[PDB]
Ligand binder design. Sequence first.
Ligand code: NI
Length: 341
Amino acid sequence: TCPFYKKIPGTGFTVDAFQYGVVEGCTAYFLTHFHSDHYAGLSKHFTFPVYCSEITGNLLKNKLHVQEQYIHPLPLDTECIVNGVKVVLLDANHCPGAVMILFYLPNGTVILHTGDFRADPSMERSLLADQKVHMLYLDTTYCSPEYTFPSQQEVIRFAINTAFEAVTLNPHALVVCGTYSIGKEKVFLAIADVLGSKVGMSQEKYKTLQCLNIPEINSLITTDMCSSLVHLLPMMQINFKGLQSHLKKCGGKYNQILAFRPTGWTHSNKFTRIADVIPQTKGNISIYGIPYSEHSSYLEMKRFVQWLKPQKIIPTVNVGTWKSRSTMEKYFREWKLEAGY
Ligand code: NI
């Protein structure tokens, strides 16, 4: 049974609610982005209307084989009428094709569902600037002040400089980057660009990347691993055993691996600056964990909500424990008292 925080009151609509079977009363199913916790349940046998971005729609059709007749892509930043209700999709600054959804209820209520997002001051100048929001369905993944991490730009600066140094010292070093879903593509694309290489990867991963409308992509990626000195591998293989085994396969072309694991937040964030990050090393293999986040830090979250001034907040993440829920509710009230709404 579908939980309440995936239902939009006063509509026939659900958000990210594909694993509950046929939801009673649902005339349109929205999908914010193509991450498995959110799409869980979609397949070629789904026969209800799915509303999403163009990029999400490319992925539904090519990766999950959803039939074309049930996929309804919408342009961003554009007022659209769905089953008699005005909606707008906004960029969520999450993974490619990820959106927030503004719903303009027939009774005059305005609702924002963030999906998964990384808040940014640029959102304060989208179509959100123009009206009041009564209810906010909020990605609270990192809603506690211990969650700090650097900008995405500082993280990519670290990665490019690290990769370029290592390979210039040893032209026989291979760079490897971990992946398990879409998102975080700037990591491997930025490093390949500084090295003058294409990124090499499996046919399944190449297929996924070809659905993402990234400019000039045929110029940046390839399935010919032999022509590439930046390889992508599944995240599970980014360990000393898995990397050793990969290096065997490269036929003595390389004698060192430098590897990157983009994580979310990790507790080494509470002590160490990005500049000071060091790898784990065994022999001719080094692994860097880099805190490249596609979710709001606590401060970024707080700034967005204090700017938006919603009347009511409904968390969509960390909702399963009473201690989590109580913690989040305390921060929401602080924010409201400090800002005066
Ligand atoms: Ni996500």
